[PDB]
């Protein structure tokens, strides 16, 4: 039991027991041990316990909490908190198990949370239509403020998945945080919306706004996923300004990457950065046929003059299903090889079609080096 | 009563009765008369009545039919046809009355039509949110193909009002025209969606597609508003290509401009077109100081050589509340006078802020003749 494991760690270190008891709000370690040893069905709120678990077992919280959450009473608030914490961490297996428990519950609020998060997950897997999710959300007769919030906030992820940034923005304008009571759920939702708006701002080349939202997410959250994508976003906002500061933010994201997917995203960010600034690149991915990491490897080859290998990778990519943004990068690299302006023109057209107001400067800058009118280039960028 | 009015026109002219019988789809005049003598409560299908009324009393069509539609049996097909005809003509009062009659009907299909059109009108009046309309449409028990079509098509209007052209597109991908039988309803829906698709094509600056959608709408509609705006769209797409073809489209739109607003739009379009191609045409005088009329006045002065009076009009407009698009035109004309590239840059920026991918050609064309790089200018236009 997680309860006894917390006490056993604290009994071996008096200062650790005192600081963790103080973090949970206790002056005496005995009341703290009683709190953490509360039977799972009798737990009232997860917030403090989640703080203790994250402080004590940072590398094993998914497993311990995977066992702990499944013992909560599905009819009560702790289980709903558990589904939100599980989903924000992207613990999909646990999240779906908890969703089943919440749906099979006798309590209407738990059933409502289970149905809304079930719709959220079906949208994540593209197993339901967005309008079908709106209608099904209408059939749930959503009563609680939280779910009234989340049944709308969840739409932002799908709109992001289809690149409908406008409908993201409008959706976020309907989110009234004042309708939410203070506590764990409201802070979690705050971190979510902070990250979403951070990526919205970065996509519009509003760097200060993106940094604001990212920093606020870091300040309100200790969830590894949130902080990882926050430092990833900050570093992304620094790509064309300062190599050392961008790299420093990226590296700050390292301690928050807990799976190889986020690790390869971070390595890819540093690989793109060092390719951009022609710095020492330790992050070339040689064990991937992912479109983006193949693109980054071809970029590295181009910088090192290995044009045949880069052109081989790009030839393989031409038969892959690259989306329009990936095609903007793709024709940027083809232009780096060919030095033909039409490739930079096509790169620009694909960055425009993907509504990317940030990385479109890649070909533009290259057009600027080749002696293009800087005013015309500035008109193209917007 | 509309029945006797038709017979009175045909009473003394057997040839008129024969061509009206042909127009209504009857081989023999006596079938036409039996149709026209049908009591409103006994009407099953509007058939050729709409063509007859439009041909005999085009200038009273709204009034007469308003008394006629309200006497129809709400349980029958001609009532649903009537709600569509009234709404596509934008006879809002009549439309809402028919919607009340359809909702209070005892026929399941009529109730469904009344509910769907009620949601559509609530969306027109901004009395319901888009997601609320999606949900309530989920509650409307929609079974008929037509309404299954219209419940989706009506969303395209709402998405158009918020400038969400992507969702528009996706929504139009869900329309099953094959589920609609031939007849008035399918023709009307085709005109609706064709105009909407024309708006999508204009937003993406797809001129050929815009023209083809406009032609489809023309082929499926005899409503003056739809045909007028379709020909206006065609002429607008032909402005920078062929003077004679654009003018031919506008002139075709002349016969459908029955209210002074449309007529003023068309005269302004012809004047603008002659100004673009620097052809001497005589000014149609209106009693207005609206922004676009004064802008046309300054343009005509610029082309006629009266540069000082054009500067006077532009000085007058500088104190007026010019829109961002209108500011694009404004600084375009100021560029024509000043020959300063900065005026054309401001015009470009205001056309981009107003999301105008078409008339942004005005400063671009001027920058091109001043020796600007053409491909860069093409990149500015997208």
Write down the overall geometry of chain A.
globular
Biggest sheet architecture of chain A: none
Q: Count up the helices of chain A.
A: 22
- Name the biggest interface: A-B, 25 and 25 residues
Strand percentage of chain A: under 5%
Would you count the extended β strands of chain A for me?
0
- The structural class of chain A is mainly alpha
* Rg of chain A computed from alpha carbons, rounded to a whole number of angstroms: 24 Å
Cα-to-Cα separation, first versus last residue of chain A: 57 Å
SSE pattern of chain A, N- to C-terminal: HHHHHHHHHHHHHHHHHHHHHH
**What percentage of residues of chain A falls in helices of 4 or more residues?**
over 70%
Assembly type of the chains comes to homodimer
Describe this structure in words.
Chains A, B: It comes from Bacillus phage phi3T. Chains A, B: Keywords: Activator, Latency-replication decision, Transcription, Transcription regulation. Chains A, B: It holds the Pfam family AimR. Chains A, B: This is AimR transcriptional regulator. Two copies of one chain form a homodimer. Chain A contains 22 helices and no strands. Chain A is mainly α and 382 residues long. Among the domains of chain A are: 1-59; 284-382. In chain A, helix 13 (207-220) packs antiparallel against helix 14. The longest helix of chain A is centred in the middle third of the chain and has 20 residues, at 184-203. Chain A binds chain B through residues 131, 134-135, 137-139, 162, 164, 166-167, 170, 341, 345, 348-349, 352, 367, 372-373, 375-377, 379-380, 382, and chain B through 131, 134-139, 162-164, 166-167, 341, 345, 348-349, 352, 372-373, 375-377, 379-380, 382.
């Amino acid at each position: 039991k997680l309860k006894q494991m917390i006490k056993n760690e604290c009994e071996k270190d008096n200062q650790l027991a005192a600081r963790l008891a103080k973090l949970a709000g206790y002056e005496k370690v005995n009341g703290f041990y009683k709190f953490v040893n509360t039977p799972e069905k009798e737990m009232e709120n997860l917030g403090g316990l989640l703080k203790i678990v994250k402080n004590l077992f940072p590398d094993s919280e998914e497993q311990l909490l995977s066992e702990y959450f499944l013992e909560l009473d599905p009819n009560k608030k702790c289980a709903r908190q558990s589904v939100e914490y599980s989903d924000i961490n992207q613990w999909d297996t646990l999240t779906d198990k908890i969703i089943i428990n919440l749906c099979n519950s006798k309590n209407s609020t738990s059933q409502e949370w289970g149905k809304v998060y079930s719709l959220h997950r079906k949208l994540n897997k593209n197993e339901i239509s967005l309008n079908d999710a709106i209608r099904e959300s209408g059939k749930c007769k959503i009563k609680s403020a939280e779910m009234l919030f989340f049944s709308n906030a969840m739409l932002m992820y799908a709109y992001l998945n289809i690149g409908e940034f406008g409908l993201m923005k409008s959706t976020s304008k309907l989110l009234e945080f004042d309708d939410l009571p203070e506590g764990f759920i409201k802070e979690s939702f705050k971190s979510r919306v902070s990250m979403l708006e951070a990526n919205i701002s970065l996509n519009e080349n509003s760097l200060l706004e993106a940094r604001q939202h990212s920093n606020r997410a870091i300040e309100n959250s200790n969830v590894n996923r949130i902080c990882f994508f926050a430092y990833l976003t900050i570093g992304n906002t620094l790509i064309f300004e300062d190599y050392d500061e961008a790299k420093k933010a990226y590296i700050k994201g390292q301690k928050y990457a807990k799976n190889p997917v986020h690790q390869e995203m971070l390595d890819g960010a540093l690989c793109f950065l060092s390719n951009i600034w022609k710095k020492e690149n330790q992050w070339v991915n040689y064990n991937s046929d992912n479109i983006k990491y193949l693109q980054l490897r071809a970029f590295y080859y181009i910088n090192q003059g290995n044009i045949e290998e880069a052109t081989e990778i790009l030839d393989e990519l031409s038969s892959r299903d690259q989306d329009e943004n990936e095609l903007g990068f793709y024709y940027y690299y083809k232009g780096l090889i060919s030095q033909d302006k039409t490739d930079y023109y096509k790169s620009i057209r694909y960055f425009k079609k993907s509504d990317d107001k940030y990385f479109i400067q890649l070909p533009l800058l290259q057009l600027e080096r080749m002696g293009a009118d800087l005013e015309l280039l500035n008109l193209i960028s917007i």
